[PDB]
Design a protein around this ligand. Sequence first.
Ligand SMILES: Cc1cc2c(cc1C)[n+]([C@@](O)(C(N)=O)c1ccccc1)c1c(=O)[nH]c(=O)[nH]c1[n+]2C[C@H](O)[C@H](O)[C@H](O)COP(=O)(O)O
Ligand SMILES: Cc1cc2c(cc1C)[n+]([C@@](O)(C(N)=O)c1ccccc1)c1c(=O)[nH]c(=O)[nH]c1[n+]2C[C@H](O)[C@H](O)[C@H](O)COP(=O)(O)O
Ligand SMILES: Cc1cc2c(cc1C)[n+]([C@@](O)(C(N)=O)c1ccccc1)c1c(=O)[nH]c(=O)[nH]c1[n+]2C[C@H](O)[C@H](O)[C@H](O)COP(=O)(O)O
Ligand SMILES: Cc1cc2c(cc1C)[n+]([C@@](O)(C(N)=O)c1ccccc1)c1c(=O)[nH]c(=O)[nH]c1[n+]2C[C@H](O)[C@H](O)[C@H](O)COP(=O)(O)O
Lengths: 334, 334, 334, 334
Amino acid sequence: TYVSLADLERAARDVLPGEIFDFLAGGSGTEASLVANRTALERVFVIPRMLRDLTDVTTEIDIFGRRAALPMAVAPVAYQRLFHPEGELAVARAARDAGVPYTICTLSSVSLEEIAAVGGRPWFQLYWLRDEKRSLDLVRRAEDAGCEAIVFTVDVPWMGRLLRDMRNGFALPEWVTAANFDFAPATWESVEAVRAHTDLPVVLKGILAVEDARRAVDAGAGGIVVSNHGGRQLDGAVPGIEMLGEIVAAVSGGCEVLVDGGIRSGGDVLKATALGASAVLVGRPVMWALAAAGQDGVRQLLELLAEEVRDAMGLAGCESVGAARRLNTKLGVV
Amino acid sequence: TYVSLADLERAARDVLPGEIFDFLAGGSGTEASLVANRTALERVFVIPRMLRDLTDVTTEIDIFGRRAALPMAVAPVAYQRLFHPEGELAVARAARDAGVPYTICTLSSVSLEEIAAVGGRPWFQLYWLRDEKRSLDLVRRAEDAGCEAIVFTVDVPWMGRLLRDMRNGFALPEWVTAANFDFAPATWESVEAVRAHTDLPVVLKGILAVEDARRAVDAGAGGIVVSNHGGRQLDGAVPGIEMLGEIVAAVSGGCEVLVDGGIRSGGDVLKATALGASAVLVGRPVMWALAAAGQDGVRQLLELLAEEVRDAMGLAGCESVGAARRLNTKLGVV
Amino acid sequence: TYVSLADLERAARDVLPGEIFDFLAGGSGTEASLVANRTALERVFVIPRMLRDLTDVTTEIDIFGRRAALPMAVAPVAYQRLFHPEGELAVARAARDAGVPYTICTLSSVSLEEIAAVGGRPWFQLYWLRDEKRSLDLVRRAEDAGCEAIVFTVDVPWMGRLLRDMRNGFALPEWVTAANFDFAPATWESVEAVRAHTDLPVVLKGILAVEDARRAVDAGAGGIVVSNHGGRQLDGAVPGIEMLGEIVAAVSGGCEVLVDGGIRSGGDVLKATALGASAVLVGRPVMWALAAAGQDGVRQLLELLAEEVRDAMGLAGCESVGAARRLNTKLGVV
Amino acid sequence: TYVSLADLERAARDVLPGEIFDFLAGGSGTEASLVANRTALERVFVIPRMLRDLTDVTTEIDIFGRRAALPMAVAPVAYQRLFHPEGELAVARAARDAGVPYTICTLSSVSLEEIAAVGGRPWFQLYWLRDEKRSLDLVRRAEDAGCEAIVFTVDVPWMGRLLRDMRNGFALPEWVTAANFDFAPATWESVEAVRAHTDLPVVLKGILAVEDARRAVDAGAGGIVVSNHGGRQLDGAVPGIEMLGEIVAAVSGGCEVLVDGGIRSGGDVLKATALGASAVLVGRPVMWALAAAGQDGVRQLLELLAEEVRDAMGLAGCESVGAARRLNTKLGVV
Ligand SMILES: Cc1cc2c(cc1C)[n+]([C@@](O)(C(N)=O)c1ccccc1)c1c(=O)[nH]c(=O)[nH]c1[n+]2C[C@H](O)[C@H](O)[C@H](O)COP(=O)(O)O
Ligand SMILES: Cc1cc2c(cc1C)[n+]([C@@](O)(C(N)=O)c1ccccc1)c1c(=O)[nH]c(=O)[nH]c1[n+]2C[C@H](O)[C@H](O)[C@H](O)COP(=O)(O)O
Ligand SMILES: Cc1cc2c(cc1C)[n+]([C@@](O)(C(N)=O)c1ccccc1)c1c(=O)[nH]c(=O)[nH]c1[n+]2C[C@H](O)[C@H](O)[C@H](O)COP(=O)(O)O
Ligand SMILES: Cc1cc2c(cc1C)[n+]([C@@](O)(C(N)=O)c1ccccc1)c1c(=O)[nH]c(=O)[nH]c1[n+]2C[C@H](O)[C@H](O)[C@H](O)COP(=O)(O)O
């Protein structure tokens, strides 16, 4: 029914109201960083290895103590009921059935306790709130509901200027709510409060500067996500993929280094791991599957990605994800 | 009404006679430098910083002793009554209300004494005239009218070959005059005469060679504008943005280093300051706002740019323009 | 009738059912490596030499002890009866008449004994089978039939995901069979078994990593083909042409270094030899000639390539292929 | 009537039979080098100098002892009566009136004695003939007719494959003859014979390798033309402009270094001299002027180029062509 992610997006374009598709597809400003995320992955070529034993090819990884089926998690994407009536529950169920971590947003259209109840060891994405006490109660909620990691999003002191939204007069419909509720910019002091408040690993999403990666490790982060936020925050922010190699070297095994932005295939996952990522986050494509076919859509996308990943690892001579990290790359043209 | 500068230009294209739009939009020769000004800014990506205190984000700067609201001034653009009946007065009033310096041209279609009377601490742009005595009387006029800086334009021994103008038979209409009047190429001797004749800071516009920047500082310039003149002078002249980093390093704090050409957004201002500029000049977009909506148009453009700038600084972790200058960049592709 | 290879392909597009043309033309995944093979050859420019003695310009080479008319062989392409009723026999006859080695596939639609009987010293391309004993009997067959080299294809643990085929529901027609029959991934242990089983030179096709080239030489390979398999295996695998220079230097005369992917002209052959290749393989264009005009088509293509090669060598000042290898190159843009 | 060279070519496209325009416009093979000649000049940007004394801006040069009005000569272009009934005489007259050297071809459609009689100190371009004695008699003819330099073309052991000509069945019409007559590849021995046979400076056209430039100087060449022959010889040969800087450094003042290919404006002339050329050759654009308007056309083109050159030198701060050679450049993108 679907052979690549490309045909998914077309499906979602038909199903969704254009102002919802635009909300999902769009970037900030002139969408330079949105485009650059794809340019970066397309410039990377792999140097595959030949003739290696591929008896037990496995795409599994251990991350934050738990096994995952792929080196991938579902990116935090707010208001998932915009794309399908079951919203976050459809996606979280498909993620659990696929063995892939799911990231519950601070701004989910279903409450985090409900999404966590689905099972499948989920993660919680935090946005720093007005006062510290509410922020730490959010952490506590997610911790009590059984979430396994606090994904502290650090690149949104405020939202980027999403011009597609401005020229649509797009507003949150009234059947979509911030189910976790009945906002202020974070600092390294905020990170310290969260780290002190939880035993869960704390993961900072939106690190792009080598020195912010070093400071994340010193701050006790269990990991970072190297990310320009899908090109929706600072327009002109460097793509995560372009900083990944440097950051991995500076961090020097001190924490997990994830990357997101533009992952559209198993080959892209391979590239990311060959540049040194522990895992990737996938955002928009998961929402395309959700809008096209609900939970079964996302399941199919996750299975198609699982096959593409295992395909690419074997054709490159990698029996484990660790070996994929030891691949070399070469930059190409366009 | 307007979300980016892009939609402004479209507005001005409708309102203006095509031969006036062409006069404003065009470059010299094959317009290679015109295009290259945009290519240069689009190749630059910022490495934003995270989690920094943004309590008092301020886009203000001190330049030539005075406070400015943004790190930006209105570029000198001759014959502004081509674009609107109020011409330079509409733009200067909007500049003053926005806290942004305005550059009165030697070739303004309203006299400099009138434009300065608007208030708002303006600057005077000088073209070297036939004989030294008239040139220095121009300086004296501008100094007496209360102008705060002499912007000595040094890259026009004569005008570039504007081919759009040749193929339109465009000529100055008879309702547009050089209101300052009832021309010869400048040299370093001319700069010295002007410097001796005024206590105002002297700023050389059109410096592109690292060694001309060094000599500007030795000559006593209070600053330079690194500029290929909007691609209207030497076609094939390197973009200012591409020389900015080198020049800033060679000048080593010896004078203010401004840049112009292609600034089209708050992100572009951020890029320029991350490459080391003290401030930028904006030319064509201001004229688009003037032609579309007179003084209120320019006010809106200046406010939209002010928001975009403050947006971009905060998303990049910069509480001051000084911090924006300490950002790193990375060159991308196309 | 035909002046370049370009007009051949058009001819084949008309003659062939679209799902057969797609099977021939297509790559894996998003076809990034397919495209990159052409991008790589188009970025390379030659620095020709002038005024050298061109009395006896000869395109001949000695490879694996035998003389060849051109520094080129026909790439292994399975199921050649898809393109013409005479299939591999038409191509092998044209190859023999042109003095160019022909590579019999494991998956040929005519048996290898028949294709070898055509004459013209052919080569045998091996895919590792289910059990070692069948694999080595294949080698033995080809050796007994008089094949001169075992081209061990090492980059297909399994096939790449050919999306053009998936979206056509393309399947092998019933008049096309694997005539050699009435599959498992290879390892360096497999290479060693083959080397021990034959006195023929063993050539590993699909080497892209410098260290796999070094290991090939240590393994006793008489040569390698530096190849990403025409962009049909790992999508995103670096083009052979981009690794050729490095590999040639690492191998340091230890074995023949061939390259394939994207060769479309005599100039391309020249580029490959200037980067250090001993010879190239040509795949798709030969099938275009086969589909357009059977054996006479391939003969014409081989003659047109022979002239283009000799043309390019002489205009570059090369009397022998050895001299072409001593040419320098320069990388260009797009 | 004409503002740039662009509008000339359009004029010639209308006037000329398409198979004649194609003969003039076309390159060899896939026309990669034809295109690359323009790409190379468009990637080069100048770093202009400011505020320099421009009292006596002069575009004149001394080359081979004689004064020329511009740093430019008309490239050798065979069979000029294809483009206009007056052929080489129209062009040579316009060249003389403009103070620009003219290169008489071995294959001119008017005899060299006639073209030289026009005046204006012309040059003779030599192709090595069947036997040495005829070749040296050609040199002697040109020397006796008063030619001032032997432009020995060294990059045509035979002609490139001009595919536009093959697909037009283009043949020399019967009103166009090789007026110098009633061919064999050259070697360094041929150069030595010519040098011994004439006191005229010998200039080798088609040098692209740094070491061929060194050997040209050792051979006693009074100069070289760094040229890939307008992309009509080896398709894929590096553009002259891309080798010019290296060659100028290796030659180290030992001979004049000219360049051709793609010169289309005064800016292009400036770029070439900033990379170190003594002068350029211009080919196709001169034929466009000849076909559009005969002798007056070429005169207009030469005057338009003279103005563009003087324009560009002054805007870059160069009072002499020597100063233009001391400009720096910067490579850009596309
Ligand atoms: C597409 C998309 C991405 C969003 C997202 C909403 C959408 C519709 N949201 C929003 O914050 C946002 N600013 O848009 C949000 C939207 C509306 C209101 C408030 C917030 C969140 C979020 O909550 N908390 C986060 O940590 N990241 C977010 N991302 C980025 C995502 O997680 C990956 O970084 C990136 O999508 C990888 O790229 P790719 O899609 O190419 O795989
Ligand atoms: C668009 C434009 C730019 C002009 C301008 C006129 C126009 C219509 N004029 C003219 O000299 C000129 N040569 O066109 C002029 C026009 C007509 C007659 C005589 C003179 C002046 C000028 O007086 N004195 C100067 O110092 N600079 C000038 N600029 C360049 C501007 O100040 C910025 O350097 C650049 O515009 C930044 O680029 P961007 O627009 O992308 O922000
Ligand atoms: C176009 C094409 C290339 C094939 C080919 C089939 C086709 C239709 N086959 C296939 O394996 C394949 N995977 O498609 C095969 C097809 C279908 C079923 C099973 C196998 C073989 C093969 O048997 N054994 C090999 O060693 N290489 C193969 N190549 C790659 C070729 O030899 C050159 O490497 C490359 O074509 C140079 O590039 P270019 O064409 O630009 O000159
Ligand atoms: C366009 C053109 C260029 C020719 C030319 C003929 C044409 C129609 N001819 C031909 O040899 C040729 N091979 O085409 C020729 C044609 C037909 C029969 C036999 C010979 C000669 C030639 O006699 N002796 C030479 O030394 N160079 C030649 N060029 C190259 C020229 O002098 C500059 O190198 C280049 O044109 C600079 O580039 P640009 O045009 O961009 O300024």
